[PDB]
Design an enzyme around this catalytic site. Sequence first.
Site, PDB file in Angstrom:
ATOM      1  N   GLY B  30      81.129  79.831  26.065  1.00 35.83           N
ATOM      2  CA  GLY B  30      82.188  80.114  27.004  1.00 35.83           C
ATOM      3  C   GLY B  30      82.632  78.809  27.622  1.00 35.83           C
ATOM      4  O   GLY B  30      83.654  78.204  27.205  1.00 35.83           O
ATOM      5  N   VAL B  33      83.820  84.840  22.461  1.00 38.33           N
ATOM      6  CA  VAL B  33      83.878  85.418  21.124  1.00 38.33           C
ATOM      7  C   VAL B  33      83.662  86.930  21.167  1.00 38.33           C
ATOM      8  O   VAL B  33      82.619  87.405  21.618  1.00 38.33           O
ATOM      9  CB  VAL B  33      82.835  84.790  20.185  1.00 38.33           C
ATOM     10  CG1 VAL B  33      82.959  85.386  18.786  1.00 38.33           C
ATOM     11  CG2 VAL B  33      82.998  83.281  20.142  1.00 38.33           C
ATOM     12  N   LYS B  46      87.820  84.660  18.601  1.00 36.93           N
ATOM     13  CA  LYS B  46      87.647  83.667  19.658  1.00 36.93           C
ATOM     14  C   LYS B  46      88.911  83.521  20.502  1.00 36.93           C
ATOM     15  O   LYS B  46      89.924  83.015  20.026  1.00 36.93           O
ATOM     16  CB  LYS B  46      87.258  82.315  19.054  1.00 36.93           C
ATOM     17  CG  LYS B  46      87.123  81.180  20.056  1.00 36.93           C
ATOM     18  CD  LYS B  46      86.729  79.895  19.340  1.00 36.93           C
ATOM     19  CE  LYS B  46      86.650  78.708  20.283  1.00 36.93           C
ATOM     20  NZ  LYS B  46      86.231  77.480  19.549  1.00 36.93           N
ATOM     21  N   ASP B 136      77.153  68.995  17.319  1.00 39.07           N
ATOM     22  CA  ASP B 136      76.296  70.008  17.937  1.00 39.07           C
ATOM     23  C   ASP B 136      75.542  70.857  16.919  1.00 39.07           C
ATOM     24  O   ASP B 136      75.699  72.078  16.869  1.00 39.07           O
ATOM     25  CB  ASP B 136      77.128  70.909  18.853  1.00 39.07           C
ATOM     26  CG  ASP B 136      76.282  71.638  19.880  1.00 39.07           C
ATOM     27  OD1 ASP B 136      75.097  71.274  20.056  1.00 39.07           O
ATOM     28  OD2 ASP B 136      76.810  72.570  20.524  1.00 39.07           O
ATOM     29  N   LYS B 138      72.571  72.812  15.861  1.00 39.37           N
ATOM     30  CA  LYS B 138      71.399  73.517  16.365  1.00 39.37           C
ATOM     31  C   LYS B 138      71.167  74.786  15.552  1.00 39.37           C
ATOM     32  O   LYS B 138      71.992  75.155  14.717  1.00 39.37           O
ATOM     33  CB  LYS B 138      71.558  73.842  17.852  1.00 39.37           C
ATOM     34  CG  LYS B 138      72.956  74.277  18.260  1.00 39.37           C
ATOM     35  CD  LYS B 138      73.046  74.473  19.765  1.00 39.37           C
ATOM     36  CE  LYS B 138      74.437  74.907  20.189  1.00 39.37           C
ATOM     37  NZ  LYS B 138      74.473  75.280  21.632  1.00 39.37           N
ATOM     38  N   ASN B 141      73.733  77.423  15.928  1.00 35.93           N
ATOM     39  CA  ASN B 141      74.995  77.148  15.245  1.00 35.93           C
ATOM     40  C   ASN B 141      74.919  77.362  13.739  1.00 35.93           C
ATOM     41  O   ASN B 141      75.882  77.104  13.021  1.00 35.93           O
ATOM     42  CB  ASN B 141      75.457  75.718  15.535  1.00 35.93           C
ATOM     43  CG  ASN B 141      76.312  75.626  16.780  1.00 35.93           C
ATOM     44  OD1 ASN B 141      76.964  76.596  17.170  1.00 35.93           O
ATOM     45  ND2 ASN B 141      76.321  74.454  17.411  1.00 35.93           N
ATOM     46  N   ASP B 154      80.482  76.286  14.884  1.00 36.77           N
ATOM     47  CA  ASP B 154      80.544  75.535  16.129  1.00 36.77           C
ATOM     48  C   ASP B 154      81.162  76.378  17.239  1.00 36.77           C
ATOM     49  O   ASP B 154      82.354  76.677  17.219  1.00 36.77           O
ATOM     50  CB  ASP B 154      81.339  74.240  15.955  1.00 36.77           C
ATOM     51  CG  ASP B 154      81.436  73.447  17.245  1.00 36.77           C
ATOM     52  OD1 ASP B 154      80.484  73.513  18.050  1.00 36.77           O
ATOM     53  OD2 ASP B 154      82.460  72.766  17.461  1.00 36.77           O
TER      54      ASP B 154
HETATM   55  O1  LIG Z   1      82.281  78.085  13.848  1.00 36.37           O
HETATM   56  C1  LIG Z   1      83.264  78.262  14.559  1.00 36.37           C
HETATM   57  N1  LIG Z   1      84.248  77.369  14.793  1.00 36.37           N
HETATM   58  C2  LIG Z   1      84.266  76.131  14.266  1.00 36.37           C
HETATM   59  C3  LIG Z   1      85.233  75.279  14.774  1.00 36.37           C
HETATM   60  C4  LIG Z   1      85.336  73.986  14.297  1.00 36.37           C
HETATM   61  C5  LIG Z   1      84.470  73.492  13.323  1.00 36.37           C
HETATM   62  C6  LIG Z   1      84.678  72.174  12.910  1.00 36.37           C
HETATM   63  N2  LIG Z   1      83.888  71.118  13.574  1.00 36.37           N
HETATM   64  C7  LIG Z   1      83.970  71.109  15.049  1.00 36.37           C
HETATM   65  C8  LIG Z   1      83.247  69.890  15.631  1.00 36.37           C
HETATM   66  N3  LIG Z   1      83.848  68.648  15.119  1.00 36.37           N
HETATM   67  C9  LIG Z   1      83.763  68.654  13.651  1.00 36.37           C
HETATM   68  C10 LIG Z   1      84.471  69.862  13.081  1.00 36.37           C
HETATM   69  C11 LIG Z   1      83.491  74.339  12.781  1.00 36.37           C
HETATM   70  C12 LIG Z   1      82.568  73.958  11.776  1.00 36.37           C
HETATM   71  F1  LIG Z   1      81.662  73.166  12.266  1.00 36.37           F
HETATM   72  F2  LIG Z   1      81.964  75.074  11.303  1.00 36.37           F
HETATM   73  F3  LIG Z   1      83.173  73.337  10.726  1.00 36.37           F
HETATM   74  C13 LIG Z   1      83.408  75.643  13.272  1.00 36.37           C
HETATM   75  C14 LIG Z   1      83.392  79.485  15.204  1.00 36.37           C
HETATM   76  C15 LIG Z   1      84.218  79.668  16.306  1.00 36.37           C
HETATM   77  C16 LIG Z   1      84.284  80.924  16.903  1.00 36.37           C
HETATM   78  C17 LIG Z   1      83.531  81.988  16.409  1.00 36.37           C
HETATM   79  C18 LIG Z   1      82.712  81.796  15.300  1.00 36.37           C
HETATM   80  C19 LIG Z   1      81.929  82.816  14.765  1.00 36.37           C
HETATM   81  C20 LIG Z   1      81.969  83.105  13.410  1.00 36.37           C
HETATM   82  C21 LIG Z   1      81.156  84.123  12.928  1.00 36.37           C
HETATM   83  C22 LIG Z   1      80.342  84.807  13.735  1.00 36.37           C
HETATM   84  N4  LIG Z   1      79.494  85.813  13.417  1.00 36.37           N
HETATM   85  C23 LIG Z   1      78.789  86.302  14.443  1.00 36.37           C
HETATM   86  N5  LIG Z   1      77.912  87.312  14.331  1.00 36.37           N
HETATM   87  C24 LIG Z   1      76.950  87.554  15.254  1.00 36.37           C
HETATM   88  O2  LIG Z   1      76.754  86.911  16.285  1.00 36.37           O
HETATM   89  C25 LIG Z   1      76.085  88.782  14.948  1.00 36.37           C
HETATM   90  C26 LIG Z   1      75.931  89.742  16.113  1.00 36.37           C
HETATM   91  C27 LIG Z   1      74.766  88.862  15.691  1.00 36.37           C
HETATM   92  S1  LIG Z   1      79.236  85.488  15.791  1.00 36.37           S
HETATM   93  C28 LIG Z   1      80.322  84.491  15.046  1.00 36.37           C
HETATM   94  N6  LIG Z   1      81.098  83.516  15.547  1.00 36.37           N
HETATM   95  C29 LIG Z   1      82.644  80.541  14.716  1.00 36.37           C
END
Ligand SMILES: O=C(Nc1ccc(CN2CCNCC2)c(C(F)(F)F)c1)c1cccc(-c2ccc3nc(NC(=O)C4CC4)sc3n2)c1
Lengths: 269, 266
Positions: B30, B33, B46, B136, B138, B141, B154
Amino acid sequence: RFHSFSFYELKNVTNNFDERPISVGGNKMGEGGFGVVYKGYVNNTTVAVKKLAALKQQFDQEIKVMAKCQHENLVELLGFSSDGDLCLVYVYMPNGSLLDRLSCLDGTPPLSWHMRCKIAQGAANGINFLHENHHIHRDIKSANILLDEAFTAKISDFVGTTAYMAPEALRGEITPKSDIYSFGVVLLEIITGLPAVDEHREPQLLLDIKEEIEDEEKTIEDYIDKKMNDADSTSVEAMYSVASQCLHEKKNKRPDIKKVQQLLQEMTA
Amino acid sequence: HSFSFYELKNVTNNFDERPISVGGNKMGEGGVVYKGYVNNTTVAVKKLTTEELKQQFDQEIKVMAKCQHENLVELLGFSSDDLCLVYVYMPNGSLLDRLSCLDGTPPLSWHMRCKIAQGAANGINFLHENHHIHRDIKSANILLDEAFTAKISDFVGTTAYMAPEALRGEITPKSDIYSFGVVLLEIITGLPAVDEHREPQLLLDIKEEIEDEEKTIEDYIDKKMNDADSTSVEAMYSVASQCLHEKKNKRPDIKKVQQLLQEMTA
Ligand SMILES: O=C(Nc1ccc(CN2CCNCC2)c(C(F)(F)F)c1)c1cccc(-c2ccc3nc(NC(=O)C4CC4)sc3n2)c1
Ligand SMILES: O=C(Nc1ccc(CN2CCNCC2)c(C(F)(F)F)c1)c1cccc(-c2ccc3nc(NC(=O)C4CC4)sc3n2)c1
Ligand SMILES: [Co+2]
Ligand SMILES: [Co+2]
Ligand SMILES: [Co+2]
Ligand SMILES: [Co+2]
Ligand SMILES: [Co+2]
Ligand SMILES: [Co+2]
């Protein structure tokens, strides 16, 4: 009544008392000395055979007690051998101890809350049988609570253990009330999934968390085992209440094992 | 795909801010999501200090447009008319959730932890080849699908995962490698990266205790595995140890980590 066993009858069935661990396919599953516990198969039943090593009349009184002690929530003695070592034969408990299952040892799935409740109730019943028959376990702990095919609790016993001991027991007193205190620690293990002692933890002793909750630094919900999905706050607080009362430092203000049985039944009702 | 706002509002039950365990749609903070279902797809929405954000929105899209990979989360679309980002929902939550067996789920086997490690590396490798810095890394993530395929996501660092140079300000891919070393220790021990009621409070500190020959790695191995053999465990600890070099230039790059992890499976 007990079955008559020859030493050579048991030597044969334990694969000449194989000292390889059961994890590699051997027959030794315990070094809880004095004595060694082996895995065997007699009378179409998997058994736990305790070969006593270097003590004789403890072998006797352990029979003297397990003869009169036959309960649903205790381990069962099948027999013994007095031939030219001395051995006792117990029925094998496939699901190991409550400690092993709380820690999910070897990848076993977490015990549910409902299963945890029943096991707690069972352990109380077995302890009650010991107290009704004027016995003091003196070593009540999760490692001594075994579980069968149906995960029913079975009090067992392979001074005591410091993390489970009551203040008076630490000072030499031998009382059934000390068992009630030890059981309170066990009830916290069931709630939290935490071991009774962790050298590298704050607090090192699980019984101390009672303080952090009483002085409202922490609440019970912060310590609840997260490896459960069926644990409602009402019954969890109920079991904690029982554990709190068992953990009273004043032995006379602890409940008896009968009150514990009552309180643990009102918990699931 | 472009989603209208009232669409996403409908499928998230009008952005129910309560957590899912209560019966709401909120999965993380926050922006926030929310869980939703639309067009044969369960989705994580998101919803995102005014026009500073519009490019944060674009940048995420910009970065996530180019980046379609097996070990990264999948961007599905967005909402232009507040601003929303739509990813594909991951049903097995994070590696953190499953390492700690949240809600009674069974422990991940050693074999499965290994594959998840390899997959996460491939996801980091993909990010690095495209000249991106996660910043980040972890266990929270690292998301997992129905087949427990590692998916990097992320939601600066977290501190428990951060490299010393990153703690002082340096922004480099070598820091991701350090953060990955901590993730590997989590995989091995089942322990969280930071626990204030634990000694040491930081999982990365156990590296010292072992190389000071006070403790061995076998003393820290997760008890909730039955298939963890000593050789490959120490093989992975070796990889984690190298990642956790305090000197960023002596740490292996993500490609060497891939090769090392594959070498471990044999
Ligand atoms: O990964 C996201 N955004 C993002 C943004 C940028 C970058 C790129 N970087 C950023 C840092 N600088 C280098 C580039 C990247 C990266 F790093 F992946 F490329 C990822 C993102 C964002 C929002 C939600 C979600 C999301 C997806 C599936 C999902 N499934 C869930 N299911 C459960 O909890 C179940 C109930 C247990 S919650 C959930 N949330 C994922
Ligand atoms: O409990 C035993 N003896 C005993 C002794 C005395 C007393 C009485 N006390 C003494 C103190 N003062 C009065 C109260 C009592 C008591 F308390 F039960 F009455 C019990 C005893 C002894 C040896 C072996 C076994 C035994 C049973 C099943 C079993 N199943 C296994 N399966 C596995 O581990 C699977 C691989 C995971 S190992 C194993 N071992 C149990
Ligand atoms: Co016979
Ligand atoms: Co119920
Ligand atoms: Co130490
Ligand atoms: Co294999
Ligand atoms: Co390029
Ligand atoms: Co504290």
